[PDB]
Amino acid sequence: TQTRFSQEPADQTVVAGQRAVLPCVLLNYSGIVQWTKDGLALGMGQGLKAWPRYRVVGSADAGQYNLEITDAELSDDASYECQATEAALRSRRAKLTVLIPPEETRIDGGPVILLPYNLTCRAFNAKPAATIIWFRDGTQQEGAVTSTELLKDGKRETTISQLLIEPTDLDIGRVFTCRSMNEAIPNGKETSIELDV
Amino acid sequence: QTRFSQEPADQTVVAGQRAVLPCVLLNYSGIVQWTKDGLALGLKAWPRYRVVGSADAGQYNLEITDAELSDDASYECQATEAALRSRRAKLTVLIPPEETRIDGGPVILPYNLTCRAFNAKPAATIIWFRDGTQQEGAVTSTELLKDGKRETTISQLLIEPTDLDIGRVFTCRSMNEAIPNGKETSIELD
Ligand SMILES: *[C@@H]1O[C@H](CO)[C@@H](O[C@@H]2O[C@H](CO)[C@@H](O[C@@H]3O[C@H](CO)[C@@H](O)[C@H](O)[C@@H]3O)[C@H](O)[C@H]2NC(C)=O)[C@H](O)[C@H]1NC(C)=O
Numbered sequence: 142t143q144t145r146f147s148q149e150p151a152d153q154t155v156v157a158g159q160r161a162v163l164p165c166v167l168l169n170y171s172g173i174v175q176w177t178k179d180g181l182a183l184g185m186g187q188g189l190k191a192w193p194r195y196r197v198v199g200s201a202d203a204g205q206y207n208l209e210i211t212d213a214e215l216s217d218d219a220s221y222e223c224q225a226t227e228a229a230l231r232s233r234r235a236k237l238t239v240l241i242p243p244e245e246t247r248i249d250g251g252p253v254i255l256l257p258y259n260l261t262c263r264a265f266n267a268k269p270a271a272t273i274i275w276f277r278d279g280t281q282q283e284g285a286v287t288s289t290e291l292l293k294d295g296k297r298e299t300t301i302s303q304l305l306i307e308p309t310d311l312d313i314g315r316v317f318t319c320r321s322m323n324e325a326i327p328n329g330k331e332t333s334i335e336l337d338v
Numbered sequence: 339q340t341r342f343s344q345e346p347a348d349q350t351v352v353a354g355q356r357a358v359l360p361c362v363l364l365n366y367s368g369i370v371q372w373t374k375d376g377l378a379l380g381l382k383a384w385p386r387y388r389v390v391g392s393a394d395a396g397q398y399n400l401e402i403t404d405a406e407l408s409d410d411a412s413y414e415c416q417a418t419e420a421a422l423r424s425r426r427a428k429l430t431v432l433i434p435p436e437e438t439r440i441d442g443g444p445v446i447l448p449y450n451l452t453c454r455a456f457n458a459k460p461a462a463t464i465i466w467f468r469d470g471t472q473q474e475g476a477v478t479s480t481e482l483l484k485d486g487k488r489e490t491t492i493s494q495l496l497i498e499p500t501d502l503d504i505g506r507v508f509t510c511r512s513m514n515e516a517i518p519n520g521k522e523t524s525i526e527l528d
Pocket residue numbers: 449450477494495496
């Protein structure tokens with residue numbers, strides 16, 4: 142009747158600036174428990190030095206060694222496992238998906254775009270690829286061309302939706318708003334721009 | 339600040355042999371650990387595992403005695419306490435063939451032969467010869483095994499027995515990188 146894992150860590154989805162805990166409890170264990178981050182060790186005891194926002198918590202008595210990450214970051218998006226030494230085995234794979242909202246998304250037309258012309262809304266630095274929705278006052282799906290652009294680090298993307306407008310004496314004074322949301326964002330941010338001929 | 343003067347390298351070790359992985363880090367005050375396929379490592383509760391070298395000069399080399407197929411893994415001497423990982427160490431643990439024999443029995447009275455090397459890494463090569471190398475006819479065909487690490491090479495020989503070859507011995511040798519000189523099984527034609 143050796144050591145076992147009552148609960149092993151599972152794949153969790155966390156948004157940026159949030160707290161996460163990975164369920165790792167192993168009964169019949171008095172031995173040291175470690176954590177693996179892409180093949181990297183964390184720390185001995187329940188005090189993880191030289192690491193920011195990393196602290197293992199839970200019941201030391203019940204064999205519970207849950208890792209706690211506060212204020213999640215793009216860096217934390219990785220694979221984890223709470224393996225233990227002293228004749229103990231590893232513990233599953235933990236894919237941490239740290240979702241991040243788009244930043245300062247706007248339409249490449251300025252405050253007002255005076256002029257078969259075009260508009261385009263661009264979402265920047267979001268993972269997963271944020272979705273752009275085009276509408277003046279009611280959804281104008283017609284024309285919207287969603288195109289995803291991968292970023293430097295290859296983890297996040299920059300979706301750009303090119304709109305096929307054809308301005309007239311009507312659309313003048315009429316605002317064209319563009320919202321952009323992702324799994325990190327329930328209700329996307331919007332930029333209000335003014336058309337002109 | 340702290341660095342790795344020498345990092346572990348991909349090493350080839352034969353079965354039942356001793357290996358050391360070079361890991362020396364200057365200007366270090368942190369504890370140094372080792373990684374085996376994303377697993378942490380005087381290594382208790384484990385046999386033949388002992389890290390050695392000079393703690394004073396910063397040398398932390400890993401020592402493995404009596405190598406085995408299980409030890410075939412990826413390693414790195416990463417350190418805790420604000421320290422980084424250290425390269426990748428692909429340890430190739432070579433193993434000799436086991437019980438290689440000819441599927442003809444002690445004596446095999448348009449016939450065929452085949453010598454079969456079993457459970458060797460890398461795939462052992464079979465060489466056919468009565469008294470001098472008779473590569474002609476030998477058909478080497480490698481067969482991978484369940485765990486996909488080792489193989490079972492089988493060389494089928496295209497013989498055609500006659501009144502001459504009787505009493506004449508047919509030996510079959512099988513060698514690999516783990517075996518400089520392969521073992522041979524002697525069979526009698528009839
Ligand atoms: C004696 O050993 C020789 C050498 O292996 C055997 O000759 C082999 O005969 C088989 C047919 O029975 C050939 O297999 C064929 O391969 C093709 C693929 O290229 C496949 O599509 C066919 O359906 C067929 O299976 C094989 O090529 C041939 N070997 C050589 C080197 O020519 C012979 O069968 C053995 N005899 C005995 C009694 O064991």
